[PDB]
Design brief:
2 copies of one chain form a homodimer. Chain A is an alpha/beta fold. Chain A is 35% helix and 23% strand. Chain A has 2 domains: 1-175, HUPs (Rossmann fold), CATH 3.40.50; 176-279, Pantoate--beta-alanine Ligase, Chain: A,domain 2, CATH 3.30.1300. In chain A, a hairpin with a 2-residue loop joins strand 9 and strand 10 (267-277). Chain A is globular, with a radius of gyration of 20 Å. The interface between A and B is medium-sized, with 28 and 28 residues. The complex binds (6-methoxy-1-benzofuran-3-yl)acetic acid (2 copies). Chain B: Catalyzes the condensation of pantoate with beta-alanine in an ATP-dependent reaction via a pantoyl-adenylate intermediate. Chain B: ATP binds at residues 38-45, 156-159, 185, 193-196.
Chain lengths: 279, 289
């Protein structure tokens, strides 16, 4: 006997079998299930994942909120009021024991991309993320799953998961939401003192400088970015990397993605941007 | 969807094709049964198929795919028996409606990239000296489950450690599938069926009944307790011609980090010349026996 679903309001479920039943049962009524997986502490970035999911005709929106200890802020009532306010019908808020009842056992092993870039400082981060995402996919069985482009390496790895395991979901990447000066929305931004928040602008400045310098080629794009980062105090750059769209080596011409990460005090920030060489 | 002819054997080599047909069928009410195999089909595989057929309103998908990922390098893979001619003839004769026979290229377009990493059970027993073996198995079973999306999937108990790890896969990744273990079909003398029985010469074939004999002996000796079960099994194996034991182990039914209570599984693995043979049996320690 299917758990109660109240159409047009915010239905919260902690039990994975519950949301699974509501989901299956809604699919059959003709709704398309959309999954927005989050760690909670929601900001405008998350509301844009939600918004893109609501505009699918016939959509019902599932937002998961789960702090995944496997890969690594806890505003629980706030988060729900924020989803209520977006017209979201399902929140899935499992516990750690419910997600891992047999503890840590079978896990996803990422390919070699997971040892690069963000995988430098956090070599197990992505195995934990893929493990949890695969689980949510199997619990919710969404037609579409939504991820920010902010975490670009993470999005590419997800697409690799989906491809490699023959998963039957569409992965939608949603452009980064940004503050008025260009800073990419992040849970972390709140830690920045004013000096830091000031210097932080350099990351988005540098990328967009590069995207525009790139009619003059790859080297000019990279040199422009480096100069802008070099103009910022207290910004310790961990990498600045132009890659192909899939994150393999950057081709000679054609589409690319430029990524950067840097520490400002104890806070690590990421940003990335589309790049077209000689275009 | 591509052509589907009911009541006939339909063969698909594209994952998209069987996936499309699977889903159309499931949408019409039928329940999808998956029997994953490596071909060289014998009577134990037919018990799987039969158990699948007795699930009502089912359609049976049998996959045949020699998965290169579960093979340790040098020669085992090339040495694997392949008889797609017999295999397909048996499936027709059983009334199986769908065979899925993928290419390596279709299953691994990017080579090894994302994979399944088994829990700690995968390094024990068969996985000890074959440390990548079960990662290979779990990865293709997950992919098959995702292509086919069946309601139930069927495995033999002969490869007991495999079935347990698969149950682990299914629970740990929250897969929407019921796993059915099917009891081991045996030759008239007790020899467990295996694609690899064909590698035993007449003398080796005769000696081989030692495995199932040791085990059914232990299973009866077990009212006298665990040392008695284990020494009965050992004594039978010791008296057999050219049976070299690699392990004989008594474990909990989940094989895992529990001690044995009164219900266990006794597992044996032994070499007969170059052929490696597995068998195992349910054990109840006495009072439960
Ligand atoms: C859409 O713009 C964004 C920006 C960030 C995020 C995040 C995580 C973060 O806080 O780092 C999830 O979705 C986002 C979407
Ligand atoms: C049901 O009995 C069996 C026995 C063995 C097997 C096998 C493996 C093998 O051929 O070695 C696959 O399915 C079986 C089913």
């Amino acid at each position: 006997a299917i758990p109660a679903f109240h159409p047009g309001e915010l239905n919260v479920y902690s039990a994975p079998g519950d949301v699974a039943d509501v989901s299956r049962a809604l699919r059959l009524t003709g709704r398309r299930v959309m999954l927005v997986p989050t760690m909670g502490a929601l900001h405008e970035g998350h509301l844009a994942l939600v918004r893109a999911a609501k505009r699918v005709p016939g959509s019902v929106v599932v937002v998961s909120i789960f702090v995944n200890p496997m890969q690594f802020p806890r505003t629980p009532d706030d988060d729900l009021a924020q989803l209520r306010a977006e017209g979201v019908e399902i929140a899935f808020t499992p516990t750690t024991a419910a997600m891992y009842p047999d503890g840590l056992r079978t896990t996803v092993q990422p390919g070699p991309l997971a040892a690069e870039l963000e995988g430098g400082p956090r070599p197990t981060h992505f195995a934990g993320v893929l493990t949890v995402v695969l689980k949510l996919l199997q619990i919710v069985r969404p037609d579409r799953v939504f991820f920010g482009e902010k975490d670009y390496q993470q999005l590419v790895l997800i697409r690799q998961l989906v491809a490699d395991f023959n998963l039957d979901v569409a992965v939608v990447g949603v452009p980064t939401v940004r503050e008025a000066d260009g800073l990419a929305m992040s849970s972390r931004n709140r830690y920045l003192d004013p000096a830091q928040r000031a210097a932080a602008v350099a990351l988005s400045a540098a990328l967009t400088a590069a995207a525009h310098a790139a009619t003059a080629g790859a080297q000019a794009a990279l040199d422009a970015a480096r100069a802008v980062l070099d103009a910022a105090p207290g910004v310790a750059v961990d990498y600045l990397e132009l890659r192909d769209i899939g994150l393999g080596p950057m081709p000679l011409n054609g589409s690319g993605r430029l990524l950067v990460a840097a520490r400002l005090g104890t806070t690590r920030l990421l940003d990335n941007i589309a790049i077209e060489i000689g275009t």
